[PDB]
């Protein structure tokens, strides 16, 4: 959350329908438009920003909200037209050795 | 690992969009069609309606 990627992806056919079968996601809320109509909207470049938070903090990621992570590590203004895709990864990112 | 849901590692990824004064690149899936024989039909080849 303090060092999150800012992948600037462009020059491709963004097929959001494929993302519904890549990984078992648990959240596909898109604030901007509908995913069906998103496949017909052109864009210059998409900024992919990924991080890892707890479950009870997933609700804190919103276009404008207070919280321990919402305003201290990553904040979204009231113009975010993307999605808040998130998923649990408690299969390979948790070992009993000291995290 | 021996915990419950709610305090587990959840990977959250956002995809911010932008539209500046530059030609767009990532439009989306270009749904094509098949090829018909000689017949009075509509064509939309590369936007040529």
């Amino acid at each position, epitope marked *: 959350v303090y060092a999150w990627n800012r992948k600037r992806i462009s020059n491709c056919v963004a097929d959001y329908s494929v993302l519904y079968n890549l990984a078992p996601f648990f*959240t596909f809320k898109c604030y901007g438009v509908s995913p*069906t109509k998103l496949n017909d909207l052109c864009f210059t470049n998409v900024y992919a920003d990924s991080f890892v938070i707890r479950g009870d903090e997933v609700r804190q990621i919103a276009p404008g909200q207070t919280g321990n992570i919402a305003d201290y590590n990553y904040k979204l203004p009231d113009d975010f037209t993307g999605c808040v895709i998130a998923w649990n990864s408690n299969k390979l990112d948790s070992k009993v050795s000291g995290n | 690992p021996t915990y419950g849901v709610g305090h587990q590692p959840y990977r959250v990824v956002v995809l911010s969009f932008e539209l500046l004064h530059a030609p767009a690149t990532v439009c989306g899936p270009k749904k094509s069609t098949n090829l018909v024989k000689n017949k009075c039909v509509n064509f939309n080849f590369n936007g040529l309606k």
Partner: single-chain antibody
Amino acid sequence: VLTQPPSASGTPGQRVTISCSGSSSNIGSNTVNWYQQLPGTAPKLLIYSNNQRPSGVPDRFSGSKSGTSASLAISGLQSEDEADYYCAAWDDSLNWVFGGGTKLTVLGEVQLVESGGGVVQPGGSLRLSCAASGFRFDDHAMHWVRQAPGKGLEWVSVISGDGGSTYYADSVKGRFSISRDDSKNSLYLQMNSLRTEDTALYYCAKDRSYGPPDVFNYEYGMDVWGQGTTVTVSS
């Protein structure tokens, strides 16, 4: 609001297609859930998230979300598939809209039992109890899905597994209080301002998610139901 065929038909051997139409505010931004209920017994989950199926549900059912509507398909139906089909969707206005039911008739282990019904004096009411047996109540959310005798189902209230923010319906808001306790698996729902229009079963539905079904718009579902009591106020 969801549009669904009230009572369709079909012939054995071939396949049918039950549809559920909805606006982009509920279906276009979330996932439709298909529930199957046999006449007489408690309902059960059929299709969740429009892509996966429970372990008990075989491959005889399939669902698609092409566009803003959901489409069901039953390849090779039989007499055992004669049940009621309900569509459910969480709208972005903090509500859970259910379907009406599809009479697809063709003429050729943790218990979630709850109680606390009984006829009472109109105006007031009593508490609604619920219980289970070792199912990790802290890591699961609970719903109140009542069903009037002969009518369809509708969502009343929902409490998350964390025990914080809970949601109520558009008609039961304010006069209802849902909460839990630090004791064994239980759920306390107090009702107020009884208007005699509450003749239902009040299914204490078990879920699989942790938070309220507003942030997790792709994992929210509903686990095995439970035998509910028949509360008939009748004024």
